[PDB]
Structures are given as structure tokens and as C-alpha cells.
């Protein structure tokens, strides 16, 4: 397989949030079969970012998901040709983001080319006022729709003070070659900022993801 | 506790779907601490129902959820006084349902007083054409909001001929007395029609639900 | 026709908002061809209502719409058999209402059988805190879908101390007999409470509605 | 600085279902009559694989006839100008975001536009180019958090008949203090006047007029 136990990552994101332009570059590595990955991210343009960094972090690759043998792995099967994804993020206060990513593989290194755009965030809301602490862990529901893979996930940002701020993700994952399609299943996630400097010009980011069916038996 | 290991259930649902009125009564039982329950449901008015029975089934009580000791159990704590819930169901093709339930307890038996209303289902869609097979198992996200408990769940009906039909649930669960509130957590579900007669006048329904935190370890 | 220049109205609404049960009865009259109507409403059960009365008022009949001769009038054509409607009301803070009505005619009097249910209104929001002043006038977009008539309208409640609270309506209108279907068009509305008592146990309600095409010429 | 006749240039860069493109435009209009025309040319990404109509409302509320009794947020904002941000939520799950920065030099506006569309179904009307036009519309304008919001229920007329719905939410952001209007309406009619194969060249027109409801107030 072209997907090895250890792989490197490189990425570039260009984007806008409430009209503010930025560029972030990243480098990292992970373990595709263990479903883990870590990245170091640097703001190259647009510093200091005027919005909560957490809204970007899920845009920074389901290759890094532990898949059981009894669920076809849409993402690992897509290589060497790779895949792209498209996502909407609908926040409960009217903010909306779109993001797209093209994921290629060269040697032992994945390359992500990412575009991110966020509009209509209230100026005194938790995103523009940087009141978020983290995303909660989540469970994404994966299902085939019109020959490609969809994932929907109810996400929540934990806020300063302990409340939550909700966002609904819908992502379409699109292999560049025919791959064996999976039945309805779940991907559990936990994404975490491990460290950052004052204005998030430098961030270390981690994610762990594991695919499964329901653990509750039938009938 | 007032919540025993084995409990009975009765219910009455009155509702409408695309203007069609119906009444369903139920009797069943469950195991609150195992998170399991079974119900037998009878259509009393509105037969034969002209829509997919599956849309009703999640309206037919989070008391029946296995809660680990390290997550406060909002539902069991609420008794004897009990609790109510309110729910919206937003389907991907424009259909919307509202449902409400008042859950009371007398001796070993719960009563659910349920109202269900669905509007704007496309006439050739899978609900009005009875093309649903089941709900998939799910994971509901539970969190406190304005002093009460909210659950959001991405639901999916498996369709005849394959494919899924999506619905987003938002539920507010409202205890009738002060209880210890939980942190953010998950409830995994699997709801199943075990058996039915041809027009779904008689249905046997089962649900299993278990609460948890994420099993993925924290690295930060 | 059976629809005269002056008609009477009687109604009963049964409903729940945030679990609170109520019944309201109404009697009024209107001028179908002018598109105007007035009703007196009385809370019979559930007084004093603990939520903004404004959320109910649009559930208290498009027969009362002035239709120009060059737009088929879906509603007037449906009588004497009549029509039913179904509506969702999606508020910007998560509140959702469903409403249904069956509209019949006996002699000179319409009868409306209404069901109304509202869920998930935030306890400190403008509906549960009774901070609404009125609905703004509106323009509903009418179009055929699956052989019946659909209406979508962006609605807004003007609030105390300023600002607006948004709600999106989707209504399906279903004639009990076949009628000539209209092309895409608009219904302009203005709904107003003319008077009320302290707790809104008694309310006098008015609406004016007029159908049109766009007034802007093609090129 | 806003004259009876003004010119326009623009550049849009964007993506729809992952497909990148660039379009440039030049046109002119009459700010006080609320009319404008532009000629648009695809510079990158030809042939566009999606319905051109989804782009056309991104290609300036300066071109709106405002009556004297409604403050004109857009014309007041110059010379400094304004930006806007928009979401377009289609009924089949497609979502677009768009942003534009509008500047003025001499007699000529420049629009710098970004447009991104995601999650359009592959056999839907957008990816299958099944749209004929947008219907005329009425946008609801209201102040929110010191800037002007507009919400509009939009509909694409389809080949064969029927409509495909999209809801727009736009935030209009002046770069200086301006007199804020009360709640009001902007009526629109946007039309492609001509185009060549694959819409490499398009002539686009819009007419827009602001108003209050002319249904008279009855309440004291």
C-alpha cells in the first residue's frame, strides 16, 4: 500500500473570515492506521487573526482514521490518486463557513490545499470575541449519497463559562477513482489544540479518529 | 429510588401528519438501568395510517438510558415529579415535525401524554409513500442550555432501494424540579420495530440507549 | 360566487407553546375581494398566556387577499369545498412552530379549525419574555410545487428597545377541488393587533393582503 | 461622488464543487434609477460545470432607487465604500458563501469578489445546468448590530417548470458612519440578457427599487 504506518503532512490554507484575509501553512505527521495526527501551524498572512482559531482547526483528512476491517475505508482506498472534500459549517447564530480541500500524496507526504470562507458571524458573538475554549469530541455519521461519501456531525464549541455554541457540519468526500463504498457508520473524533502562542500565530494541533458501527446489538 | 429495575409504561399520542389525524395508544415495559424498553402500539383512530410509521417511533423517554455513575442522570433524578420534552424534527426535504411529551409516574408505571404534528412532507417523498425501512442507530449530543438539558441528533432513515433520508432532531428536556446537571456527553441509541401487521395498526417497538463520554483519550 | 363581498369568520385554535396548553376562539368578518379582515379573539383555556401573542396571529386565510384578474386565485377558486394549509415557522434562535388549518364555508361564514404547536423557544428569548411589539409587513413568495401552492415568507418581529427577531415561514396550501394554478407571484401582507387587554385574553386582529407580480418591467 | 451615470469593473475568483474559476466584468449603470448592465468574461475555469445563475447576484446595492424617506445605506457609504458578506442556502443542501469589497475611484466602482459553493448534488439543477432564471424578488432589509442585513427568499425557475429555492442572508457593512434605515424592502429583477455557449460571455442586467409597504397602517 502507498499508505504506510507513518506518514508526513504539509498544507496551505488561504481564507477569509468576516472579510479578513489570511494564509496558514502547516507541517506534521501521523499514523493513518492508528487514526492519529499532529500538525504545527503558522500564520503567514493576516496576523493577528481577529477570530477564534478553533473555527479553522477541523479544516486542518480522514485518511487518519482507524477503520475496522469490516467497514470499507473510503479514504485509504482513494490513494494513490487521492480525494477532495467540501464542507459547510452552519453555526447556531447565523455564521456560515464553507471549506474545501484537495488531498494529494507524494512519496510519504500528504499535501492539503485548503480554502476557507466564513461569513455573517455576529460581531459580539463567541467567534469574533474569541470566547471559545475547544471543540467537544464528536461522532460523525457517514453514509453514501449519490455515489460519494457524506458525513454529518453535530459539533459544539465549549465556551468560556461552560456553555456551548453549536455548529452543524455537512461534508462531501469525493474519491478521484472508484473505491468500494461503505455502509452507514460512525467516526468518533477528538480534536485538540495542544499548544499555542499568544495570538495563535503558532499552533500545535492533534486529532484522533476511530470508525465503528453502533456498539448496541441488534434486536 | 422511585425508579425501579422493572417499570411499566402506558401512553397516548394524538397527532396529525400532512393534515391526517390519528390517535395511537401504547402499553409496554422496560428496564431503566439497562436502558431498554419495549412497547406494543395500537392505532385507535386514523387507520390505515397514510404515512411512514417510522416517523413516530422516537416519540414513543430518556429514563430508559443506561447512565454511568460518573454522568449525572438528568432523567432519573427528575422523579417522582417527572419531566417533559419538546422536539423538532427537520427533514432534509422540507418536512418538519414538532412533538411534545409529558412523562408522569404513578407506582411502577409511567404515562406519556404525547402530541405529534408533521407538516410539509412532499407527497411523493419517502414518508408519504411509506418507503422507509428503519432508523439507523444514532449518537445524540447532550448539553445544558439555559438551565435545562438539550439533545441534538443527526438521524437517518434507511430507504427501500437503498440510500438514506436525513432528519435533524433538537430536543429540550425539562425537569420539574432542580436536579444535578451533567457535563457534555453522548447517548447512543438503537430503535427498532420488532414486528407489525400489514397497515401498522399493531406495532411492537424496542429501544436501547446508553450514555457515555467519548472513549478517545484526552491528550491536552 | 359563494364568496361574497362581505363574509363572516369563526375559528377555534388548540395548541401548545413550550408545553403550555391553550385554546382560543375567534369571530370576525372581512372583505375577501379587498383582502381585509378583522377578528376578535378570546383565550378560553390556558390564560394568562406565558408567551408573545404575536407568534399566534398569522395562524388566525388567504381567501382574504386581493387578487388581480391576471393571477389565478387559488384560494377563492377552492370554494365551496375549501382548502387546508400546513405551516412551519423557523425562528432564528431555535424556536420552531408547526400550524395547520382546515378552512370550510357554511352559508356566509368561514370556519377555521387550527392546531398550533411551538417548541424549543429559549426561556429568556423574546417570545417567552413577551418582548415583541408587532410583525413587520411582509412579502410572501407563492409558487406551485407538486400540484399545490407553496408560500415562503421572511418574517420579522419588531422588538421592544429596538431590533428584529427573524422567522422563516413555509406554508403548503392544498385545495380540496382542482383549481387553475397561478404562476410565480407575490402576496404583500400587513398584520396588526388593533387592540388587546392586559394579558391578551382579548385581542382584536387585522390583516390586509394583496397579490401581485413584480412591478419591475422585464428588461 | 455618486453621479447619475457610473461605470463598473469587477473580478470574481471562486470555486463551485471544487471547480476553480475567475470571471472579470465591466459595465455601467444609473445609481438613482436603480439599473445596471455588465458584460462578464470567464478568464479561468472554462467551461464552467454549473449553472451560471448561481453567480449572478454576486455580480452592489448602490444601484437601487431609494425614495427620500428611506435612508440609503449604500450611497451614503461613499467615498469610503462598503463590503458585503452573503450565505446562499439552497433547498437541496447546496451552500454558497460570497464576499465583495466595493470601492470607488473617479466614476468607476471596483468589486473584488470571492465565491465558494459546496455540497451541490451532482444530479441537481445547479450541477446539471437546469435553471432558466431567478424570479424577481423582494429582499427584507433591517439593522442588526449596527450594520444592514438583507434576507431574501430566492427561486430559480427550472427547465420543464417548477422552482428551486434558495435563501440569502447578506450583511452589508459600511466603512463609515451612515444614517441607518428602518425596516424596508428592496424589490429586484435580475436577468441574463444574452450569453454565448458555456456562458463564457454574459450580459447581465438588474433593476432594484426600495420601498416601505404601501399597505396602510390600520393600528393607532
PDB file of N, CA, C and O in Angstrom, chain A residues 9 58 60 65 119 121 123 138 156-157 172 189 192 207 214 217:
ATOM      1  N   UNK A   9       2.735  15.213   6.572  1.00  0.00           N
ATOM      2  CA  UNK A   9       1.686  16.091   6.066  1.00  0.00           C
ATOM      3  C   UNK A   9       2.277  17.471   5.831  1.00  0.00           C
ATOM      4  O   UNK A   9       3.107  17.944   6.610  1.00  0.00           O
ATOM      5  N   UNK A  58     -10.746  22.023  12.273  1.00  0.00           N
ATOM      6  CA  UNK A  58     -11.249  20.848  11.574  1.00  0.00           C
ATOM      7  C   UNK A  58     -11.013  20.875  10.060  1.00  0.00           C
ATOM      8  O   UNK A  58     -11.120  19.855   9.411  1.00  0.00           O
ATOM      9  N   UNK A  60      -8.002  21.761   9.004  1.00  0.00           N
ATOM     10  CA  UNK A  60      -6.626  21.228   9.018  1.00  0.00           C
ATOM     11  C   UNK A  60      -6.623  19.727   9.260  1.00  0.00           C
ATOM     12  O   UNK A  60      -5.865  18.944   8.672  1.00  0.00           O
ATOM     13  N   UNK A  65      -7.794   7.934  10.218  1.00  0.00           N
ATOM     14  CA  UNK A  65      -8.918   7.349  10.950  1.00  0.00           C
ATOM     15  C   UNK A  65      -8.664   5.868  11.080  1.00  0.00           C
ATOM     16  O   UNK A  65      -8.340   5.233  10.097  1.00  0.00           O
ATOM     17  N   UNK A 119     -18.638  33.742   6.850  1.00  0.00           N
ATOM     18  CA  UNK A 119     -19.454  34.947   6.715  1.00  0.00           C
ATOM     19  C   UNK A 119     -20.521  35.033   7.793  1.00  0.00           C
ATOM     20  O   UNK A 119     -20.929  34.023   8.385  1.00  0.00           O
ATOM     21  N   UNK A 121     -20.725  36.205  10.839  1.00  0.00           N
ATOM     22  CA  UNK A 121     -20.541  35.998  12.286  1.00  0.00           C
ATOM     23  C   UNK A 121     -20.924  37.264  13.015  1.00  0.00           C
ATOM     24  O   UNK A 121     -20.436  38.341  12.689  1.00  0.00           O
ATOM     25  N   UNK A 123     -20.797  40.340  15.385  1.00  0.00           N
ATOM     26  CA  UNK A 123     -19.558  40.963  15.882  1.00  0.00           C
ATOM     27  C   UNK A 123     -19.321  40.767  17.375  1.00  0.00           C
ATOM     28  O   UNK A 123     -18.181  40.772  17.791  1.00  0.00           O
ATOM     29  N   UNK A 138     -16.722  14.367  19.214  1.00  0.00           N
ATOM     30  CA  UNK A 138     -17.914  14.251  18.392  1.00  0.00           C
ATOM     31  C   UNK A 138     -18.049  12.870  17.794  1.00  0.00           C
ATOM     32  O   UNK A 138     -17.107  12.064  17.803  1.00  0.00           O
ATOM     33  N   UNK A 156     -19.879  21.067  18.774  1.00  0.00           N
ATOM     34  CA  UNK A 156     -20.070  22.082  19.802  1.00  0.00           C
ATOM     35  C   UNK A 156     -18.766  22.653  20.283  1.00  0.00           C
ATOM     36  O   UNK A 156     -17.865  21.907  20.639  1.00  0.00           O
ATOM     37  N   UNK A 157     -18.702  23.968  20.338  1.00  0.00           N
ATOM     38  CA  UNK A 157     -17.602  24.657  20.973  1.00  0.00           C
ATOM     39  C   UNK A 157     -17.955  24.915  22.432  1.00  0.00           C
ATOM     40  O   UNK A 157     -19.002  25.484  22.758  1.00  0.00           O
ATOM     41  N   UNK A 172     -18.944  16.529   2.053  1.00  0.00           N
ATOM     42  CA  UNK A 172     -18.965  15.549   0.984  1.00  0.00           C
ATOM     43  C   UNK A 172     -17.512  15.172   0.682  1.00  0.00           C
ATOM     44  O   UNK A 172     -16.681  16.045   0.460  1.00  0.00           O
ATOM     45  N   UNK A 189     -14.443  11.325  16.977  1.00  0.00           N
ATOM     46  CA  UNK A 189     -13.330  12.256  16.883  1.00  0.00           C
ATOM     47  C   UNK A 189     -13.027  12.901  18.225  1.00  0.00           C
ATOM     48  O   UNK A 189     -13.939  13.152  19.022  1.00  0.00           O
ATOM     49  N   UNK A 192      -7.876  18.603  19.303  1.00  0.00           N
ATOM     50  CA  UNK A 192      -7.345  19.363  20.422  1.00  0.00           C
ATOM     51  C   UNK A 192      -6.180  20.234  19.979  1.00  0.00           C
ATOM     52  O   UNK A 192      -5.256  19.750  19.315  1.00  0.00           O
ATOM     53  N   UNK A 207      -5.428  15.365  16.382  1.00  0.00           N
ATOM     54  CA  UNK A 207      -6.717  14.718  16.222  1.00  0.00           C
ATOM     55  C   UNK A 207      -6.565  13.214  16.313  1.00  0.00           C
ATOM     56  O   UNK A 207      -5.588  12.633  15.823  1.00  0.00           O
ATOM     57  N   UNK A 214     -22.486   0.867  15.319  1.00  0.00           N
ATOM     58  CA  UNK A 214     -23.027   1.021  16.646  1.00  0.00           C
ATOM     59  C   UNK A 214     -22.558  -0.119  17.502  1.00  0.00           C
ATOM     60  O   UNK A 214     -22.498  -1.226  17.037  1.00  0.00           O
ATOM     61  N   UNK A 217     -26.252  -3.904  20.372  1.00  0.00           N
ATOM     62  CA  UNK A 217     -26.577  -5.029  19.496  1.00  0.00           C
ATOM     63  C   UNK A 217     -27.957  -4.909  18.855  1.00  0.00           C
ATOM     64  O   UNK A 217     -28.813  -4.196  19.368  1.00  0.00           O
TER      65      UNK A 217
END
